[PDB]
Design a protein around this ligand. Structure first.
Ligand SMILES: Nc1ncnc2c1ncn2[C@@H]1O[C@H](COP(=O)(O)OP(=O)(O)O)[C@@H](O)[C@H]1O
Ligand SMILES: Nc1ncnc2c1ncn2[C@@H]1O[C@H](COP(=O)(O)OP(=O)(O)O)[C@@H](O)[C@H]1O
Ligand SMILES: Nc1ncnc2c1ncn2[C@@H]1O[C@H](COP(=O)(O)OP(=O)(O)O)[C@@H](O)[C@H]1O
Ligand SMILES: Nc1ncnc2c1ncn2[C@@H]1O[C@H](COP(=O)(O)OP(=O)(O)O)[C@@H](O)[C@H]1O
Ligand SMILES: [Mg+2]
Ligand SMILES: [Mg+2]
Ligand SMILES: [Mg+2]
Lengths: 46, 256, 256, 259, 253, 255
């Protein structure tokens, strides 16, 4: 009726998937470069 | 077989059945001269199972118990990225039913603005979805029934008389409670079998000519929902299937 | 070409049409004094397919069913996110107008304010209801049409002098329903054939001359497809056009 | 500072002198209120003043009151800077705010909101305006432009206008020579419109018109002052549609039943 | 509880009512101004095998239908979208027992439809993230005061009316029994006296008793309670038997 | 603090009256057939008070819009709708002790009163769901270009609204009453108009114009004097000849 905007419809973000997307937008050549530079310390990550 | 809900042995009911058989496949707009209680939501789903698309369903739900905003704002639904207050691409129930049949109800309740919009759809069929967009049409029958005399209501100048014709393919009357008299004994028997099954009452313990006369005198304000509901009240009065049925709770809402 | 459909053998139908043709290159307003269930829309079409910009937009949006006062403001525009709950103006009508004309049905109900807002449009036409957006004009022509009594409105003052005037540039009296009697027989058979074909009814029943006479007796003020509506009624009265035509249905409310 | 006379035509009555007084007014930027026939010299007068507005004066902010729905007419009225009113985003500046220095092209629409009326009173208050949630007043500027078409003093006695609607309004009045009154450039602006009409018709030659038409033209009331006649003129052009072919009649009242 | 159903039509009525109590049929009841309907419903619920069953008594007016089902359904949302776990769910809340509805008579038809046949399937009871499912709670609504003409006023959804229970809870006024009057009266009185930490029931003179015996007492149990209270503070001391049938805190006197 | 004073014993009387009202900050409302510089009055009052250093900046009351009186009384809300989150405070608080003329009072609304009154009579800053109300003792005063006691007869306002003004409502004389320095007053109006009309100077008007000034109904009292003054000016635009005629009823159409 009398239109407008009315109240209706928080937490904490993390860059997890954000860093992942940083990898994906980055090219797979250097993306694998990071992937190695990532999996190095992750001992269970081959 | 649609279970033959309201199996009307009445020749009037029989002819109503024959004609409903004739035109339900005629998946076209038509005029049901009908009221709630008297076959309250009785034939629509049959004609939908009798609709051209047996695969095609019966959304309907176009009862006009809604007054002002919700009636339309669900009718067309509404737009996604625009509305009074919701980002819901409410496609409207018109989008909902594909293949089959749907009915509009309490049609007398509608305003003239709604009247012209709907009668237009009955003609236009394409529609911009409330918010406004490229209009689009559906191909299906049109169904509605009203308890009033829309010839007078249009004589009262209230509705799309254009609708009151374009829908009005043939004003299709159906039997009232007062209509059902000799088959009313059978209807009582059938509702009784149904109740004794449901109420876990063993069976028809028997009819009372006294209860029979009480019901016969019962002018029966409602037609069907009254039949079942008063059956429920009277059964609660009896609550057993031994003594012949005389405890007739004609007014489950009688005082004290 | 409107399929050349709705043939009016009244050479006044032709004369109207000729006026229409003269109007066809012409780009100025026009009233069509239409009739109840007459069909100004179809003729407006016949014009639009012939429009000087026949390639132009041809939208049918009447504010007769303007249940929302705000449905107007929309039709006049919306700022992108005006009010809120929305993204942008749903501008389809405003779209058709630029690169198009204006067509409406039964302009009687308009909020007088709405009307004179339309006035500030016709002479100049700003980007409107646009939540403060800068103006903008739609290369918009116009056409008008109703069954109302213009003198009745004038007494009602329903059209302002600026309104009644600048609003109106031509007047197209739909012949009275019975005015175009030879046309009635004409387009009547036109429907008869059109029905016998599209119905795929294996034979065409034809027409009973008695039925023809009775039909002519129908003042049938509504005849827009109200002709076609009573036609479908009569077709069902025949039910099947195999036999020669005699079963003519006009009043469908009647049981029995 | 140029001509821009445009199709300001047919002022052979004292509407010429009307224009003269308008000119006398034109330098001053104070409130403008006028009077006259709708769709008839009126908004043309508006153009007239818009020319009287320096070309470099600014946006001829057109104010069309028959719009505005009900409410957030208020929004663009006072303004809307907050959230929850106009899609939020930036401080949406109202059409009132849209004009900064511009034309208060007030239209005398006679719509119901004297609520609005009081608002505009505050619009014409101290050169200032303040938005929805509009956290501060802001001293505003705009040229002010009204006109009329009906008995403002009567409506005052009728109470119909806010008394202050007029009290703040109309430093002076500016009426129009009625079509029943102006009556002077009849043939003149008649021919002017006819010229335009044939030219658009691309009619090969000016039909000419019989004097019976002009006799009717004198006889005609022309309730719509400027256009109704002009529409009539174009209508004659159409109903004839012939070049050099002298007219002997005109088209105005199609409501007249055909013979 | 102190029903003191000394109408004894109250007695047989209670008999049938508890007879329905184990059955979970839908509940639609008409209650007197002072009927203590809560107690009746409470007694049925404990008498129901939903003795422990959930019994959300919906004083159905405080909501916003702008979140009508959003209560009646609720919404499941968590993590970055919203802090907490998820909504309890109105149909979900009373799940498994009494589904008591109050504040129903003067209600918005938003609710009326939103509930209308909303349990006939019931599998559509949690949305907007809340996860739809069907349920079983003994549906209860009561305190019915709308005349049948209100259904003839149509504002009573006759769809709800047919959707209503098989009959209606007949309810009589306090002018009816006039029986446990002195009794439940004294019950209230001593109850207050202890609540007052009062000395003792000083008594009542028969003059008050007679003045009482003439009263329609529309406020039924409430009338009893309130009359007791007014006369109670009026005595302000517990020396001699009281004497006043305190009618109403209205007269300036 | 300075304006076209009415220069008059009634005018100087209302002056001394407001002067008695000067540092006083208790609530108030205005009496007056019309306004006669209603704004200018409260405005000079604003320029005077201890709210001279305070915020001598008004607010137009009955301007406001329907749903938002909460914020109107208390500025933009932090928690109203999602968008804003900052408990922006009272326009009152935007003064909260300054001088903020409660104008437009007559046109105000019903439940609108229901709140604003009660709060003013009693209520610290209780905003939308807030923690703790803060009383913005803001210099309080309203106005009435209309007759409240009449409204009382109508009963539209609260009798509390009657209580609202903590001061007696001074009134100014009707133009028909006041009509005091209108000679000198008009002279100043004319010096003004000539400056605005950039006119060289004013030789004068008719003494007949003077009598018509006497023979003047003068409803738009504080306005129409200077109004039709400069109106006569422009419709004349002539300074060589006296304003023998003045622009009487612009509403009147000449022959
Ligand atoms: N000349 C025609 N040819 C075909 N159909 C027509 C004609 N005139 C009217 N109609 C029919 O009348 C129905 C409604 O028509 P009409 O009354 O013209 O629309 P409106 O209600 O806008 O006047 C339309 O669906 C149309 O099929
Ligand atoms: N010189 C003229 N010749 C012909 N028509 C005119 C002339 N001047 C104005 N008109 C017509 O008068 C109509 C209304 O103009 P106007 O009164 O200015 O509108 P408004 O109501 O906005 O003031 C216009 O549509 C225009 O076509
Ligand atoms: N038999 C009773 N025993 C104890 N209290 C009763 C009895 N009957 C009525 N009351 C009192 O009367 C009041 C009636 O309340 P309620 O049933 O909510 O009224 P309504 O049904 O009109 O809302 C209860 O608060 C209760 O304390
Ligand atoms: N004492 C005064 N000194 C100077 N100007 C005044 C005085 N009183 C009123 N005015 C003028 O009157 C105008 C205000 O009009 P006002 O009386 O507030 O209108 P309303 O009566 O509609 O409220 C201002 O422009 C101001 O210049
Ligand atoms: Mg039509
Ligand atoms: Mg205009
Ligand atoms: Mg004022």
């Amino acid at each position: 009726m009398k239109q407008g905007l009315q109240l209706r419809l928080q937490l904490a973000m993390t860059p997890q998937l954000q860093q992942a997307i940083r990898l994906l937008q980055l090219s797979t050549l250097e993306l694998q470069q990071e992937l190695q530079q990532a999996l190095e310390s992750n001992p269970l990550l081959e | 077989e649609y279970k033959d809900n309201l199996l009307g042995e009445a020749n009037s009911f029989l002819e109503v059945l024959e004609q409903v058989s004739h035109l339900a496949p005629l998946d076209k707009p038509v005029l049901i001269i009908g009221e709630r209680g008297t076959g309250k939501e009785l034939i629509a789903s049959r004609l939908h199972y009798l609709s051209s698309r047996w695969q095609g369903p019966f959304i309907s739900l176009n009862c006009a118990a809604l007054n002002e905003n919700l009636l339309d704002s669900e009718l067309f639904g509404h737009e996604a990225g625009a509305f009074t207050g919701a980002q819901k691409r409410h496609p409207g129930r018109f989008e909902r039913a594909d293949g089959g049949t749907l009915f509009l109800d309490e049609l007398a309740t509608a305003p003239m603005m709604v009247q012209e919009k709907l009668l237009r759809v009955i003609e236009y069929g394409e529609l911009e979805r409330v918010g406004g967009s490229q209009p689009l049409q559906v191909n299906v029958r049109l169904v509605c029934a009203t308890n009033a005399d829309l010839p007078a209501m249009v004589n009262e100048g209230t509705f799309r008389a254009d609708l009151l014709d374009r829908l009005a393919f043939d004003v299709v009357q159906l039997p009232p409670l007062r209509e059902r008299e000799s088959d009313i004994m059978l209807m009582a028997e059938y509702f009784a079998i149904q109740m004794c099954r449901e109420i876990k009452l063993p069976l028809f313990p028997g009819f009372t000519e006294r209860a029979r006369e009480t019901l016969l005198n019962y002018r029966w304000p409602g037609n069907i929902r009254e039949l079942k509901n008063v059956v429920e009240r009277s059964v609660y009065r009896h609550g057993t299937s031994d003594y012949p049925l005389d405890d007739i709770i004609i007014d489950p809402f009688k005082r004290r």
